[PDB]
Structure formats: C-alpha cells, structure tokens
Amino acid sequence: RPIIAFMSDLGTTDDSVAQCKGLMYSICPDVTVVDVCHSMTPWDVEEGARYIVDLPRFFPEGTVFATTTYPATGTTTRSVAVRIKQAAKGGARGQWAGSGAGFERAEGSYIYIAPNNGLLTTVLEEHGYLEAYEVTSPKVIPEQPEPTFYGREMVAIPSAHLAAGFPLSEVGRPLEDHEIVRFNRPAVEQDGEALVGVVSAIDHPFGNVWTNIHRTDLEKAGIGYGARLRLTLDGVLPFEAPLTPTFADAGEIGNIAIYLNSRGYLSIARNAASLAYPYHLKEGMSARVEA
Amino acid sequence: RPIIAFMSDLGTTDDSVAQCKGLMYSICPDVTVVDVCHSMTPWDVEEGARYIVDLPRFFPEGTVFATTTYPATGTTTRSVAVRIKQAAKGGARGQWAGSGAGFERAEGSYIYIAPNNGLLTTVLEEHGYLEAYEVTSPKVIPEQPEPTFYGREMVAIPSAHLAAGFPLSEVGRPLEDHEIVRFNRPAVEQDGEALVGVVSAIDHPFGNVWTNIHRTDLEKAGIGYGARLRLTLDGVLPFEAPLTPTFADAGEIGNIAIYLNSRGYLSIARNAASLAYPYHLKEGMSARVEA
Amino acid sequence: RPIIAFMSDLGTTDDSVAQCKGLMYSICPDVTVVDVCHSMTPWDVEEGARYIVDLPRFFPEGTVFATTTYPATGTTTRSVAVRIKQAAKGGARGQWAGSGAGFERAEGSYIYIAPNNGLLTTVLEEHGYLEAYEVTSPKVIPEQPEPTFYGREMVAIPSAHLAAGFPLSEVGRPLEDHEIVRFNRPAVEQDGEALVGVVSAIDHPFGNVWTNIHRTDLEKAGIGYGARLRLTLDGVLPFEAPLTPTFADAGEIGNIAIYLNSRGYLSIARNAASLAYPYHLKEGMSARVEA
Amino acid sequence: RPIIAFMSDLGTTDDSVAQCKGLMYSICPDVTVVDVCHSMTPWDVEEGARYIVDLPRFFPEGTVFATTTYPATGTTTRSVAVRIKQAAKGGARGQWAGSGAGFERAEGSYIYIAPNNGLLTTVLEEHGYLEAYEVTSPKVIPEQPEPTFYGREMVAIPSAHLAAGFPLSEVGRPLEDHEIVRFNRPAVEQDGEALVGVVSAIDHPFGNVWTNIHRTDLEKAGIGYGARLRLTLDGVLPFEAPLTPTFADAGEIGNIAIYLNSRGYLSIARNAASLAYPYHLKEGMSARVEA
Amino acid sequence: RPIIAFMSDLGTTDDSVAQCKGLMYSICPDVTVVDVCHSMTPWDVEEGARYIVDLPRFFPEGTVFATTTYPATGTTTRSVAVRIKQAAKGGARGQWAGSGAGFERAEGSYIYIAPNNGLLTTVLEEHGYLEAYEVTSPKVIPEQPEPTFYGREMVAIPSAHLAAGFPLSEVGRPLEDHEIVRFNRPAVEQDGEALVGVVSAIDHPFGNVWTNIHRTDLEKAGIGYGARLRLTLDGVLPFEAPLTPTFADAGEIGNIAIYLNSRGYLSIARNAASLAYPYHLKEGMSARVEA
Amino acid sequence: RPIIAFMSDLGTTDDSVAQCKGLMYSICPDVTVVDVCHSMTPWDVEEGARYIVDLPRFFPEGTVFATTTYPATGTTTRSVAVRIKQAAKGGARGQWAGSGAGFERAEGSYIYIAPNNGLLTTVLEEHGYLEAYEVTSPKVIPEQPEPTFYGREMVAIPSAHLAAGFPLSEVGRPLEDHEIVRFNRPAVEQDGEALVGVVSAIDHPFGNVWTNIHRTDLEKAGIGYGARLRLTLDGVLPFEAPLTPTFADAGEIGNIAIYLNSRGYLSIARNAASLAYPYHLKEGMSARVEA
C-alpha cells in the first residue's frame, strides 16, 4: 500500500541506496520504494529540486517523497517534513496526468521530507504547504546518527516511519515559514520584447536544451504555438523555428524544433538528433527568446 | 501478482521513469514494476529490440512488457499492443530458463505494448503473435496526451491498464500484419565458406564482442564446439580460437575465447579481461567467421 | 515479506539483471528484490566484497543476499550458500542501524549466496558463519545451466528458492572451512609511528578518498578525533587536517576534512567539493597517516 | 642565397624532417631551409594544397617549394617539378605582400616539386605554369630509392639539386597537362540567394572557422563589407553579423565576427575568443551564407 | 650576420609563420631567423612575456626580437619598437650565459618589436630601455596592411628592415613612457612569514611546477639552499622538502624537489617523474612557501 | 659551413631551445643549427637513441650532433663527446643516402656530444667510435653551470665550440670504454621458428607500428620480401600479410601491409589508413612474427 519515492545524491555505484532501502523495509514492511533518481550533481539543490517538483500528480495519494542531498550532514541541522497543499497540474498545457481526463489528486495528500537546505524551495512554491515540522524525535531518527550519512539517518529512516503511519505532527516542533531555507530562483527578465533566461538543463539522454522560460512567461508575451521564434543560446546562436507541440513537427530528421517540454518550459531540440551533444551546449548558458 | 517489465530510452538521470512508475502504481495498485533497462541509445529501435526479445521465458505468465523509444511522440501515431504466441526457448543451446528442467511457459501468455515503429520486429519474428491492436481507447490513454512524452502516455499508462486486467481486445481496433511496422534485419551472408555478419553489440560492462551470427547459422555450416575458428573483425583485426562453451576454456587470463553468448550468438572475448575496451572495438564493425 | 538483495557485475545497460529478476519473481512470487548495485568492476572480488559486507544490519532478518561476479562461469565450480552468524554493528562508531537506539538483529538471520571465488571473504571474516553448503541440487539450480551466465543460474535462481523457504541444508553438501575460497586482504602496516595502507576506493559521486585504515588501526596507534594528522597519498600528495566526525568540520567550502566514513575507515575529502576528481586520485594509491 | 621552403606530412616527433634537411645541406651547402609546416593530416592532398598555394608572393624569387604527402611512395610513380607563371597577389583584398606598396614578383620565379598526386592542384590553378617535368634523372634522385620515404627521395633531394642550380628541364621528360594529376575542388553553389559551401579548415590555434566561400563568390552575389549576413554552419548552428575587415570590429570580446581571412575567404570567429573549440566545429561541416 | 628571433601566437599547423619568414628573407637576405616558439596561448600577453624576457643574454648583440600576439589586429593600433638597456644577467644565481665566465653583453644592444598591448611589460621592467618608437613608416610597414595579420604586417616586416639596418629612430615618432601599454603583474605577498604567490606555469614537457616567487623574494626572507620548506599548492597541498639546486638532490626517483628554475624562480618537481601531469596541477593555482 | 644537429627533450612550448640556439650562434657565428626534434619523452634514453642513431649518413662530414635528455642535470656528472667511426649505411636495404649511388661518407667524420647516461648506446653500437672524452674544460662549458639546464650547459654550449673548431681532444680527459654508460637493448628472441620482439614505436603522424625486429633478424630466418607472415601484436591481435617493400602493395586502401621501414625494421601498417590510432596500439606491446 504505502509508497516512498526516493531521490538522493548517493549514486548507484555502491551499496548506499540499498542501505537506506533495507531500513525502509525494516520500518515499514509493506512499503514499495520507488527510485526517483540518484544521479544528481551532489550538493546542487537547484538541480535536485527539478527532479522532485513535478512528482505529486503522478503518484497515489499518501505517497511520501524522501528527497536528499545533505552537504551539512553530521551538523546540528535537522530535516524538514512538510505536507503539501496542491498536488498541482503540469505539463506543456497544465493538466492532470493519467488516462481519460487524468487523475485528479486531493489536496494535502503528499509528504516531502528533506534536509532543510533549500531543496524543497520549488516544491513549496509550486504546491504550497499545510504544515511543516522539524524532524527531531528519537522515534523517527537515530539517537546517535551517523555523522556522514544524514540522508539515511534524517530522511530515509523518518520517511519510512511516516509511510508506516507515524503521525507527521509528532516528528518534532512546527516550523515557521521563515525557518524553512529557500534558494533564490533566477527570474525570467523582459528585455524589450525578448524574454531572457538561461538553459536550465540538458535533457539526457537526448541532448535537448531546456530553458527556465515557462509557458506562463510565453503567455504574458502572447507566444503561442505557431509563433516564429528567434531563440538565441549562449549569446551568439539565433535559432529560428516556429513554436510547435513536438519534435517531429520540425519535419526532416535533424531540423530544429522549438517546443514546450513535459514540465511546461520552453525548449529546443533537433528532430530525432541531438542538439546539445555535438556542440557541447551546457546548463547555465544564456537563453533569449523573441517573436 | 501482476508484473510490468519496463524498457525505455528515458535514462536514469532525472525523474522521467519515476513519473511512469507513479502512474503504473496509480492504475494497478498491486503491480510490481521491473526495470528492464533505460539506457538504450534514443531512437535506435534495433538496439531496443535486443533488450526485449529474450525476456518472456524468464518472467511469470501474464507479464506485460512496456517497451518504448518514441521519436514520433506527439504525432497521430498510436502504439501497438500484441499478445505473443510462443514464449520461446533461448540461450546458447535453446532451452527453458530456471532450475531443474526449466520453467515451460504456456503459449499466449505475454503482452508487449510499444510504439508502432518497428521496435517489436524481432519479438514478432521470434515469438509470433496471436492478436494485435492499435491503442486508441481513452480508457487506456490520455484524452489529451503530452506531446513529447508518448512513452508514458501511450505505453506506460495503457500497460498498467492491461496489467490491471483491462481486456486487450478493447484497447482499439485490430491491426492487420502489414500495418505493424518492421525494420529490416541485416542477414548473415555466406561467402565461400565464411559466414559474414556484423558486431551487433559490445557486451558491457565486460567489453565482450557480440555478433549477429546465430547458433543456427553455425549449425548450417556444421560449426560446433571444438572447431578452430578464424574470426576477423573490422576487416583487419583477425582472431583464432576454438569455439568453446565459456570464457575460462581459453586457459590463461587474457587469452581469446570464441563462444556462444547467453542469447545464442557467436561472440568473442578475452578470458577475464576486456577485449573491446583496449582496442576500441565497436558495434557495426564487420565480423567474419571461418572454420 | 521475503527480500532478495541483489549485487552483481551485470551492469544496467541491457536486460541481464531483469532476466534474473523475472526468475526471482517466478520462483518466489511474494519476494521483493532490492538492487544493491550492478556497477562493480567485473571480476574484482575485493571491490564486490566492499559492497556487501556492511549490508546485514540494515535489512530485515531473513533477507537473502544474492552476490555475484562469476568469471569462472560455465566451469565445474559451484556456488557457496552460507548462513552468517553475527549481523554485526558498523559505522564510524560501531553501532546498530535505525531510529532510536537502533535495530538489533538476531544471530543467524541472513543468508549469502555467491560464487565460491573469495567474494564472501570479508563477509565471513566480519560476521562469521553457522553453516555453509555447496549449491548443487537440481531443485535450486538448472540441470543444464547456461555456460556464460552462472550469476543467474547459480546465484539468482537458488537465492529465490531460499527466499521462498527452500531449506538451506538441502542445497548440497556441507563445505568445510578450507573449501571456501578466500582472497588475501592487504594488512595495514605500522612504519615507525605512521600507519601505511592504500586508498581502498574513490567514493562516488563525491570524489572522497577512502583508505583501508580502520578505526581500530587508528585506536591502536593512539589516534582519536581532534588529532592533527598528516595524510600522504600516492607517496607524493600531502594533506594535513585534524581528524573530525564530518565534512563541514573543515570550515570553509573546499577545505580538507580527514574523517571516519560510514563504514568505519579513515577517509579524506574536501568540504562540499571533490578531492579525488580534480587530482585524478585513484583506488590502489598508497595512503600513509601520522599524528 | 638559395631557399627551400619545405612542407611535408612527416611531423616533428622524430628525426624524419632532419634527415631531409641533412641531404638538402649536403647537396646545396649555401641553402636556407624554411619549414612551411609538417603537421598536415597525412595523405590529405586538399589540406596540403592549402598550406602551399599562398606562398610564392612572400618569398624571394628563385625559391624552391618542396611539398609532399606521398601515400604512393615506393611505387612506379614519379614526382612532378613545375615552374609556376604568376606569383599571384592574395589576401582579403588581393595585393602584393610586404612594406610600402608591396613587393612585386617577376613571372616564372618559383619552382614547386611534389608527388604527382594532385597536391599541386590549386598551385597550378591559381598561378598557372610555364613548364612541368617528370622527376626521373639519377642526377637528382636516388638510383635505389628508399621504398617508404619518397618525400625524401623524390622531393627533398631533387629540390636541393634545383636550389643548387641544376637545370629544371634536365630532371626528366616534359609532362603534358593531362598527365598532371588533379583533385576535384568542390564548387560553391548558389541556392536561391544563399551561397552554399563548406568549412574548409579550423584556423588553429585560435578556433576560427574558415569556409571555401571566396571574396569573388561574395562579389558575384552582391555582398561587400557592411552587409548583414546570416551564416549557418553544419546545417544547425546559426550566426548573424555584418561582414567586417577584422575581429575587433565585433565590439565586445566574445562577439561574432564574420570577415575575410588573410587568404581571401569568408570566415567566422568570436572576437578574442575561440568559436570552433567550445562548439567542436569541424572541417567539412556545411556553410551557408545569405545577405 | 643579422638575427631575428621570432616569437608569435601563430602556431605550427599551417603556413603562417613561413609567410612571415619569406618576407624576412625578402627584406634582409643575409638574416638568420631563430624560432623562439609559436605555441603560446593566443592573446595571453603575460604568457608571451615569459617566453621573451630571458632571451637577450643568450643572443649576439644586434639581435632583433620580433614578438607578437595581436588580438587588436586590423585596428588603428601601431606596434612599438624599443632598444633595451641592460641585457641583464639571469638564472638561479644571476649570471651571464655561456662557457667560462659567460658572455657579457653591452648595453643598448637589442631591439624588440611587438604590438603595443603590454607584451613587452616585463622586458621593459627587467631590462629598461633607451628609446621607443611607434612603428608607422610606410618604409617598414605595408601602406595597405592585411587586417587580420598584423603580426606579419606590423612586426615581422619591420623587424626585417631593422635587422637590415633601417634606423630605429626612423620607424615613426618617439613614444613617451606612459604611451607604452603595460599589464599589471601580480605581486608576491608577505603573509606572516609565508610568501604567497601563484603557479606561473607548468613547465612542459616535464610537468614541473613554476611559481612567481623569485630568488630575490627568497632572499628577503633569508631562504637559501638547505632551508626546509613547506610549499602549499592550490591551498591544500603542504609539500615539504629542502630547497636544493637540482632535481636529483631529492634522492630516489619520484621524490619531491623544491628548487630554483633556470629563470630564477621557486619551483617544485618530482625527481625524474612528473609532478603536474598525474594530479592535473595548473597555472594560476595558489602557491605559498614558508620556512 | 659548420652544422649542429640538435636533439633534446626541451619541447617547443617555450623559449628553451631558442636559448641554446642563441648561445650556439654566439659561439660559432657561421653555424647552421638543424633541429632533429625536441619532442621525445623526457628521460627516455632508449627513445632519444632512436632519433639520433640513423643521422650521420644524411649529413655533411664534420657535422656535430648535440643530443640530450639530462635527468641527472646539476650533479657532478659530465657529458661525453665522441668521434664516431663508421657513418654507416641504412634503410630497408642498407645503402648510402642521396641521389645517384648515394653519398659515401668518410670514417671519423662526425661528433656526438651527450650526457653520459646511455643516450649514445646505439650510436656507439652501430657506428663504433675512434675517441671519446669527458667534457670538463671551462673553455667549452660554464665555470658555474645552471643546475637544472645541463643540456644547454653541457651539450649545446660545448657542441658549438666543437663546431667552431675547438679541438675535440682538449674538452677533457679520454674516457675508457667501460666509463661510457650503456643501456641494455632487449634482444629479439627465437621461439620455435617465430621471432619475438616488441613494438619499438608508433610511427607518428601515421600510426604505423614499428618493431625491433631488424632486417638482419629476418634474413637469419630466411624471411624475404614475398613471404606470407603472421604478425601478432599484444599477444592477442594477430595480422597476416606478405612482406612487401611498401604500403601500396597491400592493394585497397585500409588493407594490412607488413614491410621494412626506412630504418631497416619490420613494421606493420594499413595502406593509407592508420593502424595504431583506431586500436590504440602502443609502444612496448609484444610483437611476434612467423612465416
């Protein structure tokens, strides 16, 4: 019945993740552990945030997201555990996921547990929350935690207790909003009639280029499907294509497609060929779009 | 009880596969999702085929194979769902898998669902099929599918409905045989008394070299275990060894072994050393064998 | 209820692991298969040992560890199956895992099954064993095993029978202690007042450097937290820092931390930066430590 | 007084070039040997052509160009020695080289000696010739030439005899025009109003991109300095800039400059930054230019 | 008789340097052109400066140094031509070069010609100068210079006229000191009793590490040969060795040597092994030394 | 008239070689300095030897070879200066170099000067010598030599004095034969009727493979041009071809050629393609040949 969806910076080249899973099954025998991914750049909370923010609408209600990169491991820091508000629609269009008209998710139906280091910034921003607690109770964490392995001690373990029905409000004291650490998200800037952002990610394993320019930013400027766009990357690359729903709309294999990715963001690719890999395009390069 | 075995080109560097799994558990609460792999070269249907064709005899009857690389995502194309006929023996010798005499599998016991883009070419060729349907019903796919994520929309989602016991014949109309896209498989050619093929794969993580020269191709030349072979790769690097059951039969560590791999194909390796990696041997290089 | 924790050298780039899993579910329908890792350097039994030795205390009692690199596959060799004695405490300090005071594990609670090639060397050394058997019974292995895939035939399959409650003592004859293959572990030497060992692993994905110098080796040399250490790597590159519990104790980002890792061994890192990657530090480099 | 300007595919990692030089000084004691370069891709006659075609106007009259890549070494092939007609103006503008108004060179003032394999194709095309001879006389080549080192035997040695005043007409028989091997040069095509060519070279060590679109091809298309151009590379990567004389005209460091190189061809660069290296741009990529 | 020593950023993979040499021989037939090197990082004036500052004492009086990296090519900028004052002693000890007691060089005996872009900063600092002129006369430069090739037009050509005895004072107007562009050289800082500098260069092809901490800096602190030093690179590498004259003084092959290089600067190496290459040490890393 | 041929481990990435040249022109104004190469692996005397042993027959009588890799720089070691006996024929066939019947060189006509560290081992072995002296006289070396630059101090400088006619016997005391350091050359072994040696070099820039199996080794096995050979590299990659004079005799581009290189040694290549580079073949790999 209960699900823990687990996202960490632990990698998959040793037994580290398996140690966390052993403890999850120990504490909540009937649990199903779903790997989110374990491949994020260590300590890059903005990147980790990207792998967890879009999750809730896909999962059954009552799912617990155990999400961690813990560079402050072994310090007096304690994890935060939050019940989110809106499961939140998503995608290029903003919809429920699933067959038919999709699976509508109730509010207050998902818990995230993470270091209190900004990792949940965009989860809180995009979903809101109903309650948040500091994770301190020796009922849900070790009395003597391993200094270097707080993702296990302070996330995996308590997540399993939560999955098992340990009451959220009993993990430790309520946290005020200002006590929840946030990172600052770079805003999309208007520059004349151009929108100015960045490449937010290279979409592996395809080598598509994702930007932080959202559907809603495009709406502000009236850019809908069909608009001929100039999208300039790294300052010197004035790509030109219409905004289309998908890759194949570019026609011939190799042709430039400018589209909305499954996360709702303006993106650029080649049709059934890699854009980013041959030219070594990178996250953090500038991205400007104009009609 | 139900199992979905999931093979995609999504990778494991973000939450993409986790989103599919979330929907799979949502639709079919009792399901077990088994990762086949998510590492294939995007949009290489021939390679994808290799990862799925050998699967049925290993899995419990009733298993659904959700298999996808979807470069035509967001177009009017629709997936194909097929009930295969013969589970099919396999391996170096052609046998059932498992302990004792192996686990014999009843016919008609497995469903594959895939883009209709040739991905199932070798599944159909080696297993046959009993029935095939176009996947169109809004009961099993989204009414408004995400343009760029058809592996989720048109494979993961309906696969979970099938695992959940949604009648196969209700997914959409029956497809005639000519409506199922196939790729052309390069044939092994006889060239005097040499068999001429190709390196089909580098067997990672070992760096063994796999060819498309099947056991049946060797029997047809009368080549059995013990035959001294000259196996020439890339037209220029030749090798000489007896055909042996396994690596250790080569003797000293590092010695050349020519063998039949666990999928029934002529292969070449060094004994407990890598052959491919030091010499940068690659898929697609010619492979010629002669007694 | 039953759990198989699976560690192999099979990788995750083809369907090899999924084939084993299919058979595991076939044999033991209610089993949960947990991936330990599949990324070990092929045939490196010392490295594989490291990924399995610390597992038992994390898992529910009754867990079966299926652990394999099988370079002698297809030969007359047979696997060994052992019931270990002590679950064994671990970590920087030596404790039970889990919330509160941790979860104590009963003796005799875990089975390992592996090639008899030394892979279990440190498992047996650190946990002891109560019983050990050669795996030969056609009830738990194939009568005609695939020559190249003994990890599946002789580890995965029988592990699933064991998980299903097949009596351990029925897998084949008892093995005497001398019949269980061991590798020799390089000892830490005292050299004057310095301890001399090796880099045992680069801790991915962080680039931390792990040595084979154990807490107890430090204890014997009169070294505890707070001791200023000089640690020399590769007989060239020197570092100096106090022994501290964790990374952040080093102060500024990028500063050297010398610490005890979660496995109980002397290690060195940069605080929230990679030590090993910029300097290309490697497994097998010498490591010398002095107060 | 006498000069040999030496261009080979011999490299500079062994004594090969020094062996040729030793013989040059032996034969013509007062000679000055000038290295052109020795780094060309072996056997690439088109690339070797580029390193020699622009030389004559820079050198004193009477200079001998010894130019060689000799993949047909050790065969019945013999070198060609030609006296060119026009020294030929060059550069972005088409002028004589040197201080003041430049140094005009008399017609018939330079000899090239090379394998008869097409290496001199553009030399003959851009300079014309007055006379051409097969190099066969044992007075200027070895009676027993080294099979693998014809660049030394059939170019370096005879070039030194020529520099020493050995009569050109005495090296062997006159060659007719059809007996002089030519490669085919890919033409620049007009495609609507766009010029379509290729990247002819990456200009090391800067990473500037050179095309085969000549000043005169631009002239015919109505394009002069100041014209805003769109230049597309590899059919994917677009750049836009005015045609300017030099790099600094682009303004800020890193800005795109589109210009005429010192050989007279349309080129593109970043101002005091590398264009080609970060994007891995390559020789042979398509290059399309439009006003 | 006359010598031009030529240092540029032109590389040795095309005919660019040979074009400059052709013109040098054209203008000054009896000249000897000596390659300094052509491998510097383009536009890195600090690096170019390093390859030219130590030259004068090695060369016959009357030598002309033609030294160029010209990113401002094709602009209104003009080269500077300077007669230096002190030829200047050098080396670990500060001496004349040559056999016996060395070759004492007269003052005012060397000319450098370069872009006026800071390239001569350390030449002027270490040698002083007696006169400096802007290079503008059409007698020594082209009336219509190639826009992209000012190293040839504005350095190679005029250098050859100077070698031929064209009067220095006739190249153009005298320049005031403030009109000669300088870069700022990073000072060695005292930090307690440590000297703090940088790695100024990796010494290829050996991989020795050179710092900007000079013999004279070492004298200020009393550090002479025999002093046990701690030299910390990149902030975290506290190397320890005595200051010794040479590599072999470190004893065993591979041992750390801290020494004075042939340019007079504090350096660190391994004895007959590479220090920098295995650990990827780099120019610009911090370098701290203390007794 | 005088020539110095200069082979060092100094590289061409800084002004090091230029400093030596400056001193050479200072000491011997009329000299011509010919670069042999400066690219050898530092401190690899065996490799250095390869670049110098074949030189004499190519150069005018009276030529001085200044040859250095000086890992013992700054120690009490002193260079050796030798007058060699036989200039020595060479090549695939063993002949004089040059046009016509070649240039016969008188005995005693060449001097080498080198560190006394084995660098001249093969020079002495293949040419013999008439006289050898330790280089100690302050007339030909510095009274206070630079500790780290002995190739300049103890080779370049005295070589220029010798070129200038300083009497060889006046450089210091005569050395007895046992005082001249030699390295041990690995012998070609006979192994049944196979000849067993080593890959001595990858022939750059082509990627041909050179062995230490000499023509004389082949004659001793009766192997002449036309013999079908099996040549096995690295113990595992074998090749089959007739021994032919040159590359083109292999026929089609890419075909394997086995030949005698221009230095008289058994070699293997592809015809106008690289053999070594795609397969990463390396110096030091075993090389076995059999008829």
Ligand SMILES: Nc1ncnc2c1ncn2[C@@H]1O[C@H](CSCC[C@H](N)C(=O)O)[C@@H](O)[C@H]1O
């Ligand atoms: N160098 C470093 N500096 C700061 N935090 C680090 C670190 N290396 C790892 N961490 C943190 O420590 C945790 C993993 S250490 C635990 C896993 C490890 N493979 C083991 O077996 O012990 C993660 O939360 C990670 O972000």
Ligand SMILES: Nc1ncnc2c1ncn2[C@@H]1O[C@H](CSCC[C@H](N)C(=O)O)[C@@H](O)[C@H]1O
């Ligand atoms: N450039 C491209 N051209 C054609 N198909 C592409 C493509 N890039 C991805 N795809 C297809 O689109 C699907 C993945 S898009 C979904 C995964 C992505 N990481 C995300 O989060 O949105 C796969 O079926 C893939 O084969």
Ligand SMILES: Nc1ncnc2c1ncn2[C@@H]1O[C@H](CSCC[C@H](N)C(=O)O)[C@@H](O)[C@H]1O
């Ligand atoms: N070159 C080699 N020498 C010795 N053993 C090898 C080997 N390559 C693989 N093996 C062993 O054979 C087993 C894996 S072969 C089975 C997996 C393979 N990808 C397949 O589908 O056939 C492993 O136990 C491995 O260690």
Ligand SMILES: Nc1ncnc2c1ncn2[C@@H]1O[C@H](CSCC[C@H](N)C(=O)O)[C@@H](O)[C@H]1O
């Ligand atoms: N693999 C190959 N196929 C065809 N020609 C080749 C070749 N390798 C080298 N050559 C040709 O042979 C000549 C050089 S071989 C002479 C130089 C060599 N380093 C030596 O010392 O022997 C060149 O003209 C080159 O183009």
Ligand SMILES: Nc1ncnc2c1ncn2[C@@H]1O[C@H](CSCC[C@H](N)C(=O)O)[C@@H](O)[C@H]1O
């Ligand atoms: N991208 C760039 N931006 C600014 N200056 C550049 C540049 N590329 C080269 N240069 C400058 O231009 C000069 C070389 S261009 C001349 C050589 C070139 N290989 C040719 O044949 O035309 C040098 O002075 C160099 O520093």
Ligand SMILES: Nc1ncnc2c1ncn2[C@@H]1O[C@H](CSCC[C@H](N)C(=O)O)[C@@H](O)[C@H]1O
């Ligand atoms: N780490 C090291 N150990 C032993 N010898 C070394 C060495 N590094 C350089 N050498 C030797 O020292 C000489 C070069 S030092 C002189 C060149 C240097 N680029 C400079 O400008 O000072 C060569 O003889 C070389 O072989």
Ligand SMILES: [Cl-]
């Ligand atoms: Cl963690």
Ligand SMILES: [Cl-]
């Ligand atoms: Cl998909």
Ligand SMILES: [Cl-]
């Ligand atoms: Cl296996």
Ligand SMILES: [Cl-]
């Ligand atoms: Cl040649």
Ligand SMILES: [Cl-]
């Ligand atoms: Cl220039």
Ligand SMILES: [Cl-]
């Ligand atoms: Cl030297």
